[PDB]
Design an enzyme around this catalytic site. Sequence first.
Site, PDB file in Angstrom:
ATOM      1  N   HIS A 156      -3.528   7.811   1.529  1.00 21.45           N
ATOM      2  CA  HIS A 156      -3.922   6.484   1.090  1.00 21.45           C
ATOM      3  C   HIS A 156      -5.398   6.286   1.421  1.00 21.45           C
ATOM      4  O   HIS A 156      -5.836   6.608   2.525  1.00 21.45           O
ATOM      5  CB  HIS A 156      -3.062   5.414   1.762  1.00 21.45           C
ATOM      6  CG  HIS A 156      -3.392   4.024   1.333  1.00 21.45           C
ATOM      7  ND1 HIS A 156      -3.286   3.607   0.018  1.00 21.45           N
ATOM      8  CD2 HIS A 156      -3.834   2.952   2.026  1.00 21.45           C
ATOM      9  CE1 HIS A 156      -3.648   2.346  -0.070  1.00 21.45           C
ATOM     10  NE2 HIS A 156      -3.985   1.918   1.136  1.00 21.45           N
ATOM     11  N   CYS A 170       0.807  -1.206   0.000  1.00 21.08           N
ATOM     12  CA  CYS A 170       0.000   0.000   0.000  1.00 21.08           C
ATOM     13  C   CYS A 170       0.835   1.249   0.000  1.00 21.08           C
ATOM     14  O   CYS A 170       0.363   2.291  -0.466  1.00 21.08           O
ATOM     15  CB  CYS A 170      -0.974  -0.007   1.174  1.00 21.08           C
ATOM     16  SG  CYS A 170      -1.718  -1.519   1.378  1.00 21.08           S
ATOM     17  N   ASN A 176      -9.659   0.456  -1.329  1.00 22.76           N
ATOM     18  CA  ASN A 176      -8.218   0.323  -1.152  1.00 22.76           C
ATOM     19  C   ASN A 176      -7.576  -0.336  -2.367  1.00 22.76           C
ATOM     20  O   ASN A 176      -7.730  -1.539  -2.581  1.00 22.76           O
ATOM     21  CB  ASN A 176      -7.904  -0.480   0.109  1.00 22.76           C
ATOM     22  CG  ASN A 176      -6.416  -0.557   0.399  1.00 22.76           C
ATOM     23  OD1 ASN A 176      -5.598   0.025  -0.313  1.00 22.76           O
ATOM     24  ND2 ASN A 176      -6.060  -1.265   1.461  1.00 22.76           N
TER      25      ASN A 176
END
Lengths: 319, 319
Positions: free
Chosen positions: B246, B113, B276
């Site tokens: 994020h 991520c 995500n």
Amino acid sequence: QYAKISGTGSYLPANRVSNDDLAQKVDTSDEWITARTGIKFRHIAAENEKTSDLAAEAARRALDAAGLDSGEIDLIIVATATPDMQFPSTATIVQQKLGITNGCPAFDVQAVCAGFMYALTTANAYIKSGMAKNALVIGAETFSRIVDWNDRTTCVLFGDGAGAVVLSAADKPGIIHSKLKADGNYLKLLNVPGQIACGKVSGSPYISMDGPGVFKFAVKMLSKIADDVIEEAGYTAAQIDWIVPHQANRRIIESTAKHLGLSMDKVVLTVQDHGNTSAASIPLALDTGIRSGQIKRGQNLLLEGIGGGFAWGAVLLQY
Amino acid sequence: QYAKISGTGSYLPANRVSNDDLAQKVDTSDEWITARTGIKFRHIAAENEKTSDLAAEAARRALDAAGLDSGEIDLIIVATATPDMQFPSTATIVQQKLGITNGCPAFDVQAVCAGFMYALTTANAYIKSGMAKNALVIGAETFSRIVDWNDRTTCVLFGDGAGAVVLSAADKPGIIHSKLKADGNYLKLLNVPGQIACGKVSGSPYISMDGPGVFKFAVKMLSKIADDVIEEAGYTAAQIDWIVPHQANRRIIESTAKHLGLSMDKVVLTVQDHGNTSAASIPLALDTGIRSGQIKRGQNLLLEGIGGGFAWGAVLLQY
């Protein structure tokens, strides 16, 4: 700023496998393998150890060789084509196993056989721009587990191992100049098509290679890129004390050394003992040369190699 | 030298999936998912497209936005946790698909991520040290193929997409300061254990996650890293025009914004639409913010996020 080699280290799994030993499981010959590649031995990882295990030990030895504590490391880069997991990074796993809890950045680089040069150049960029002072650069591979051992042509070519380098900020240059390249048009010549998708392997989980093609272009590309890095730095091939090439095939190495007008006496050779260890190959040879007394401080080294992609590079540095 | 965003681009696969769609597949609710994460939609890659395809399209749009020809690119870095193949790198595949034959370096980075910030920081290091002038930085993921769609807890969290940026050498700073961190002790909180070994998948091929734990540490870690980058760069939280975080969980972003003493009106938000997307998340929001009229040049942007590893970071830059 500049980046200099503070220490080096390497690890090879216990199981050392000769061509004759492998001749039992597959239809090949010791003489045939040697004539093609110059390979006589391989190392294969144990059942319980993975790339992170190989990588950690090499790093441990590299840290000792540089007289550095684990907490002094502020950058970790692992070059590997066989990570422990889909994610997270093998570098973070190595970091954990080294007992590094200082929160330093850690990540993997994927450039295949040319990965260490890609990882080394990356660490060099961080140090030159002042983003790091002591980087841990590791090439670690467990290629034995992505080889088709029922394919005599490819399975005899690859081995396992890990090589690590501690790269540190310095007033005077270790790494003088580097040059990286890549061309995705050569995908078909060396690849593992498979990926993990939808709960299974999708595509071939084994290495597919085109020996003649890889041979043809490696000789062509490596001679060109070597000449470039040298003349760009302002050097000549004669000022190079050692060539530390990727150790996939000795025939390729012989050809490249001849082109630069260098004797094989100026070429570190470990292909016979290790085989093609991918990203671990160059740092393995570098450590081997340093440990054997061949490579001395103040000497100029030319790192070089090509890998799947194709990706290739050359790194000129003063040890 | 300094590195600046010359152009931006992004791509989301056509198949748009709402929470109610997943409610058919798994025992979940639209309100429950929205309550937990603020996610309402995801995008899933088509059968024939993979990370390289998503990445290539995002890059073309980024190349156009910078008024650059593909041949002008001298560095390609792809951040992904779902590469097309075991090897070679997805970056070389992208390079090939973009028709770039100038031989520029190309490689993948694995930071999950936090991949884009790792790659952006990496590209930044290359540019400052004069090793590159026009870098193509891509975060591209196809997490849908490593999700267990029979697990209500994890499957509703992830989506597919790609985001690209063209980072180029400049007289005045774009990227002011960055700070990357990693700690392999948090492996068990987020990972895909499986690997390709001996012709099959070895270990679980699906994402395993500890929601409470990841949530617990993300809020604590992201506030800390955010404060650090600011104070280290010499700025204050008040001088920040935009936070481009994020986009995994809106609750975490809210918590982080409140800690910095910033309003949600200064936070680009796409989590509800994208979910995500790992390394693609940040550049997705960035491209969206610039294109929607929110982000203006001369403004200060704070990129931030945490990912599997754990690896996390924050990047302060002036658009």
